[PDB]
Design a protein around this nucleic acid. Structure first.
Length: 50
RNA sequence: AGCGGCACGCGAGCUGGGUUCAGAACGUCGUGAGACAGUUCGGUCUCUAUCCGCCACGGGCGCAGGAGGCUUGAGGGGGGCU
């Protein structure tokens, strides 16, 4: 009952590949709905998404 | 009641609403410290311009006797609506 518990757990933290697919949402030309809130202009030391 | 470039023009010209500095809470994953382009309320922006560039006003020797006065125009700018 643990291998059907502690492996259902494992296949739902690989379910946070969703923040990979938001940069390419429509994947063709996503000038996306986060590209006006970046502050990443070489300074303002901020953690990137990758 | 246009489209586009000018380091997605412009912070040694000004603002700091946005997002991702330290505080705190909701949902969700984790036994746990913690975490999530998922949401929410708070958060320090620096008196003296050396050199090119620009806007206005000056000091010398020039135009081959020393001075006053009125002037032409090479060239360049502003103005152009409905």
């Amino acid at each position: 009952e643990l291998m059907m518990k502690e492996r259902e757990r494992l296949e739902s933290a690989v379910q946070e590949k969703r923040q990979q697919a938001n940069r390419l949402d429509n994947k063709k030309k996503g000038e996306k709905s986060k590209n006006s809130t970046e502050s990443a202009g070489r300074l303002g030391h901020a953690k990137m998404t990758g």
